């Protein structure tokens, strides 16, 4: 734990990037988190929503 100050910065940046990646798997109330599934399953008036 001698170099914990640099490792904290590296871990915070990597964990923030991982959280930003994992936010793509959330639908945020939509029917799916994949844009291709929405564009292939729905007409554009509801796929727009």
């Amino acid at each position: 734990s001698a170099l914990g100050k640099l490792q904290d910065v590296v871990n915070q940046n990597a964990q923030a990037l991982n959280t930003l990646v994992k936010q793509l798997s959330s639908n945020f109330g939509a029917i799916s988190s994949v844009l291709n599934d929405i564009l292939s399953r729905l007409d554009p008036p509801e796929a727009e929503v």
């Binding site: 007409d43 554009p44 008036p45 727009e48």
Partner: protein
């Protein structure tokens, strides 16, 4: 835009509709602004034969 249609086809004169005269006779855009006007004309546009 003036035409004569059936009574059940008046729902197809609208943005974002799936339907028959919407696809092959008269299509409205998704960003359509304006008014659709419909009234019964059985006394004028109909014959007993």
């Amino acid at each position: 835009d003036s035409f004569v249609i059936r009574g059940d086809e008046v729902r197809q004169i609208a943005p974002g509709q799936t339907g028959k005269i919407a696809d092959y006779n008269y299509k409205l855009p998704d960003d359509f602004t304006g008014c659709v006007i419909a009234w019964n004309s059985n006394n004028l546009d109909s014959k007993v034969g």
